[PDB]
Symmetry: D2
Subunit: 469 residues, 4 copies
Amino acid sequence: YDIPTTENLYFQGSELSSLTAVSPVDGRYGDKVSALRGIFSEYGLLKFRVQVEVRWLQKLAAHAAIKEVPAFAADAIGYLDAIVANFSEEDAARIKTIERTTNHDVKAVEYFLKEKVAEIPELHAVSEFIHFACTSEDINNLSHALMLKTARDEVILPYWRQLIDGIKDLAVQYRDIPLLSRTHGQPATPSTIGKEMANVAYRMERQYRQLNQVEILGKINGAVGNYNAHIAAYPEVDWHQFSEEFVTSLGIQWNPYTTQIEPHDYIAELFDCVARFNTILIDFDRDVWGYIALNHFKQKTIAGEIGSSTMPHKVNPIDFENSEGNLGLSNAVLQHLASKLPVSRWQRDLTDSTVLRNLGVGIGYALIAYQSTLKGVSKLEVNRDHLLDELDHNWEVLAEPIQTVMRRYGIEKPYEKLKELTRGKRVDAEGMKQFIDGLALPEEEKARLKAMTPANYIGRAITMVDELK
Amino acid sequence: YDIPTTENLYFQGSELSSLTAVSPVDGRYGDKVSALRGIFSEYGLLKFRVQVEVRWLQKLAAHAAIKEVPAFAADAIGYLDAIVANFSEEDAARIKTIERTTNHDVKAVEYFLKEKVAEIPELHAVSEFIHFACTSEDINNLSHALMLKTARDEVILPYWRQLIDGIKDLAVQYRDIPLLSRTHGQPATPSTIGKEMANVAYRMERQYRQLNQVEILGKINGAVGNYNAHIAAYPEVDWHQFSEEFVTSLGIQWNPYTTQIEPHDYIAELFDCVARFNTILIDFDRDVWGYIALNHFKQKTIAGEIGSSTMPHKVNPIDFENSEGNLGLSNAVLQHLASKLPVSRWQRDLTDSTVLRNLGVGIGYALIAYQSTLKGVSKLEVNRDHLLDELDHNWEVLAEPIQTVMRRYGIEKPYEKLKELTRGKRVDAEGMKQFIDGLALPEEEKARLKAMTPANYIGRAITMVDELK
Amino acid sequence: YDIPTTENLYFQGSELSSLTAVSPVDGRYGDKVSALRGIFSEYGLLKFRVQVEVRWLQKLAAHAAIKEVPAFAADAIGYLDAIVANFSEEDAARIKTIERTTNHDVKAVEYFLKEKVAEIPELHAVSEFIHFACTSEDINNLSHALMLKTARDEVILPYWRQLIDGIKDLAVQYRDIPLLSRTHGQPATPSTIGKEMANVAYRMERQYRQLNQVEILGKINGAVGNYNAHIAAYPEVDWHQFSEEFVTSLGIQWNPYTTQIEPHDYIAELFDCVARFNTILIDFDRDVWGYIALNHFKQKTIAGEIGSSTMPHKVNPIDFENSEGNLGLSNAVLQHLASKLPVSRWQRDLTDSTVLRNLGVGIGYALIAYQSTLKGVSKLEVNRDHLLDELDHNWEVLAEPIQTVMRRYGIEKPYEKLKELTRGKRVDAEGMKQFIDGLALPEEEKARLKAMTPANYIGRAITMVDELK
Amino acid sequence: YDIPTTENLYFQGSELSSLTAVSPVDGRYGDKVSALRGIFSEYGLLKFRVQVEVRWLQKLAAHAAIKEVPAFAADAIGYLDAIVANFSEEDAARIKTIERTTNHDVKAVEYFLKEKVAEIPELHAVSEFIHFACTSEDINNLSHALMLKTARDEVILPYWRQLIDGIKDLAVQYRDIPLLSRTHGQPATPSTIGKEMANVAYRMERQYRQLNQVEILGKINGAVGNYNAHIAAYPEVDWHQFSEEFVTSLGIQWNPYTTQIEPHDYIAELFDCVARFNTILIDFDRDVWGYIALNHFKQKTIAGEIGSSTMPHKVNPIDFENSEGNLGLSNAVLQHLASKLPVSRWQRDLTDSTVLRNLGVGIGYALIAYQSTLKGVSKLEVNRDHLLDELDHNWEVLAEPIQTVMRRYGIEKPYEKLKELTRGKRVDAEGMKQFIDGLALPEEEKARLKAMTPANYIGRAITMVDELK
Ligand code: NA
Ligand code: NA
Ligand code: NA
Ligand code: NA
Ligand code: NA
Ligand code: NA
Ligand code: NA
Ligand code: NA
């Protein structure tokens, strides 16, 4: 005479919103990462598991040697396909309710699917072939592979393209604007703003190419990697071929040698590459913050906006700073996953399950940063007057070309002579010209050196920018 | 003739729930971290900023030399106090709406508060003293200090206490249960299960003590740390004393030397300590996973629960594994914050703002782990039959006490003789006894050695457990 | 009337030996890393800088448009080549002595080379073309590229090959030896020892391939990347072509877009890949330590060797443990370099110079680990008697194939029925057979299930091993 | 008829010098870390193990209940003490030679000591009491504790004191020199150079205090922590008291609850604190590099020194950059040790042995950085002319005090009015004065505001500096 009790209730209260979320990835920045909610959330994971389970059953049906699962009629195929396509938050809630009993999420998916097909006698007939011979990780690893492939193609690389193109566009806009370079933070041989942008774009494109080349791997092969259960029931089926077909049919590259888990090395490869690109963008964010500090760039201001609570005058590079901070966090999460995921005790331990729930987290921080950098870039206005005025107060940078021309034409101790003239000393255009005048150089060379200025001492910068891409 | 437009709309859709959250801290494990939503979320932060701003105004009112802010009547004090106490998600939404204009969160709080007091003429009268002389970071750093102090006292240390007490309780339960120790993974000198628990408890208590000792610091001193604006308006007020009073009135310890920001070293100290404790718990989780693998512990099973999707027999230490994975993630976030927060360019850069929104994240993962370890511990059942049977097959561990007794009584080359007998060799009780019998030892010593067994060769283990705490 | 003083003395005392070295990479393990001393030490770096500087001068000589550096006679070519080939520790000491004056290592190399060619009037004649138009980083980045290429081809990949081959050899040796698998540390579906080795080998080969594919990059282009000085002196020479020719002539891949430094992204790519391989080897070291703990492997013992200071019986997996610890350290250094090197302020800051002196350190720890794993592997002896005896006490692992066969043949609730029989329960061969006997299965299937044993329930393990490579 | 062979030769060649060392800690910077060679090298470790072993024997001799080790005569005490005091590299070489046989370093120390006392019949008589009841880790953990205590007191804290005092000295030198502050890299409320130094000094002193407070722990208690062997041989001796006495007699704090190893949590505490201090110094190095870039500081130049291979004019902050890079490396090593050392499998695994050989490495990098920062500081010369000229071009920073004074005196919308005047706009002294003139403020307040300048708008900066320490 057991009476109704509610230990199994799965209740989503009204407590969670972007205002009360602990993580800013779902809180303050929840709107910037909305693409990931369909991919890396518990809903997204459940949805991919359902897809993989349905596809597995469908392959068993279509395989001629598995006689106990007859080929499905159009009607049946459509009902299964709709389970996948129309998978809802209510469906997810059903699975969560079942898990309150099973304390096992994939077995809950299995029981959810057995409940789903109960009313269609043709599907109900093959109900015990749902999850046939599979281990939970057969379902999970393929789900994660599909999640990462989706994220890469639909979210990550499109943002990388916007950043590369945006920075390439700064290179073009500013191709011929001279810049007093800084090495060790000190005035050095001039470049152009555009050439400094070109360098970054070039670095980013290398990683873009590498991210596309990373293999996304998947496996399907039973409890510990050897098709034991498959062969026990169907010794005459070539499960090794079946596996390769199934994985590749999902658009995933096949990993034939595994334990219970797919080993996750490809995740470390994907994430090492995202992290390199993020590091390039940290470098860019910091450099631009620095060019803004030097007044080489001004930033556009927006009506109603407030720069500082106390200092009315402030216009700050806040978008680059937000980006820089989130890329740090992204990398910290990505590095942890990359280092930790590929170590699993013996034929596996379960530490990777909770950690893999965080795939979207590391990626989330990065997406938030990408959008911020993009915002900050749209506000940049180059300060040509400042750039040129600074160059015009740094005539000592012509010590290099003077000493190099002197070397060409056999003057004794050229470097040493210019060190004497300039190191720790203020020398202006007249000072540099008088020095050139006293040199034993051919007149045409003297004329060339007297015609140089810090602002035109830019070497091949403009042509480099023109040759990019 | 401007017409209504909606660029300023702050709309929270119905999109976010625990099912669709990107982070499992708000998703799968959202229910385990509900305490943090009132502390570290955007709502929690806004709520503390409001408290600090209201308290600042109240101190200006109560200070006799600030004549322009007259002392508040009971009525006024109560209205301000209710703003703080009854601060709502709708209030937070007002602040977010204002931020859509200001693009500055603390100035939005200021404008929100000016709107709030507009209808009370006594408060409206001193409206321009809201945020008086303050910089945003005066408000923020004190908010974060209050958040961390709350988390420490109300959330973190209570969980640490449950774990310490729980492990101390395993020490008591199992005080006298002999264990074949393992060093380098190999059979070694016996201990007891309880003594192995005692060691862990002792380590955890050291960190508990240290976390309580960490200073939680706060400052209030204007745009760059020097009270410039305060002194400009009120040169005769001792702002240095005012600062110390205000900070300490909030229950925070005073940091008198700062730039625009509080430097965050105390956050690194708090987090380094949480990380050490988490590392001790990783060690414990891994060791218990190992004792379960060896069958020294069985785990209780629950009706309806599923151990494996394919392997019906499985009972797995899933709670320890979940804990172990989340403690890794906790530490990775905590370490990043600890290393990054205390470096800020010149009088500050804004990278710390977005990073500090993640204080609850590192703490969230740890809380999820603490609860899991606690769950896994409640399921442990010691397997005395297995422990004793293993000891009874490892008589070679008596080589140590035999050789040490031989050393006491002047027998030549004792270690070397036992190495010869036992290293790489199987020796049972009869083999060990026959060896003892052939030794030139006093009879009472021979009798003592013949009476030892691996299971009683436990030294001072039981008394150590009894002396703990 | 200045008198002799000794501020410039460069004195190498007798203080440093492997016994007194602070780092164990030069101390305790100095003999394991002797290959790196010719590559990554200050001597090795100086030697490569000298090579690059000499090669630069030689290209200027051979270029028809640089008329001021006439083509070198055979005599001259040979004297320059010998400077490079016969570069000595005394030469390095000369450079260090010069640096005591210059406080600049590359300018010291330049002055060292000007001193070296002073006695050959043909070389002395073009003395001011040593380092012509170059910046220190033109010399350094190419040196580091040559160092990394040498390390990869001569040291790293050969060790990776020994490990891959060694582990593949364990796969072959042990192909058909059944193993009770462990998932979550618990008895699971059997595999073979050889198949577990095969998985690791397969993972390692993926990284081997990737390390070979990483680009090793170099640049040469003057103070800030734009050939400014080159064009100032020789505007009619195509320096962009000259650069590509020179870099590729050294066997390095060309990086055309740089600041003063080569940006170091390729170093992060090389090191991310070494780190993934090291992580795979940590996983292997830990698993083997675990198989040794379980007594699945015994280790061979050596005459005179001591297992423990106190416990005469001990034979420990010390080589795997040494490897595991050093791979941790390797990864920590490699990760730091990978994350830090590619961020450099504006056209560069000097933080990368001291950090790049540590390239050999991260690599050193890894080499020490590789040798240790190799040593530990040479000592492994499989314990077939233990492996088989364990399998024979774990008949519950046949619950999986029984339930899967039941699913094939339409028996109701197969998983649930086996969960009832086995979860948390001891069932032996007779218990499993009696259960099978009571099942409504075709006789041939019943006979197949009654003929299975944990030791033969190994699926496709043996054929997988045979198909590897 | 065995013939002489040389498998046991321990040969230190002539290969290793500072020029050929792989690590720059023994190579390029070998001279900066010479203090650590007596502490953390293999020689240093061997020397401390010898000390601990000799002290253990001496306590057994002096204990009245251990009748088999008679109290030592003065002669004997002196011979043992000299073994410790006069321990040589030849002695270390003897131990290494023995290890070629034992493959066990502590047993080699034991055999080395048995050989050492063989000629003194009184010591030879108690030869089998060398290492009595001890496990290797009893000897090792106490050695490491003594190494860390020595490093802390003799090396680390003295350098921290030099840095704190040096920075405090910059605070004094520059107390009243106004600085245009930068927040988000943008011109903000002025401070003084000295006050910016004071903040850093204050942070460093907090860590200095904390490093002194960290407990340095040690244990002595046999193979697995329970005195098993001690009690087997001497059941009537109170070993728990003996342990506490012995450890504290060495000047180490007692850790009574351990496995085979001391758990290393105190090492994580020491290293977390060094890392916080190093992070404060990274912040300082970066800020000073930035003040040098802005020309707020010039650096003194030295005769003969070279700033750049190509750019004769360069004077670079190379000492701060060297420091910054080495502090990164220090922290990476320290963090790895702190995270990894306290996790050891069951009653211990041997991964900590090789890792603990690196204690001096993390500390080495830090020492190299400390010396560099000290060098760079000795070269600083403040550029008052530049600092003041910059302030005089940044009159917009007076928007803050103007708006705050306006708030005091009830002017409508003060912040908003100053935002309108200054945000994104150039306003000079005349512009600011004309704005003040038009304000409805009391004349004395108008006069105060008209008398302010960016250079005197420094609030309480000077008094703060005066109050430091
Ligand atoms: Na079929
Ligand atoms: Na594994
Ligand atoms: Na008042
Ligand atoms: Na700072
Ligand atoms: Na030529
Ligand atoms: Na850069
Ligand atoms: Na005695
Ligand atoms: Na442990």
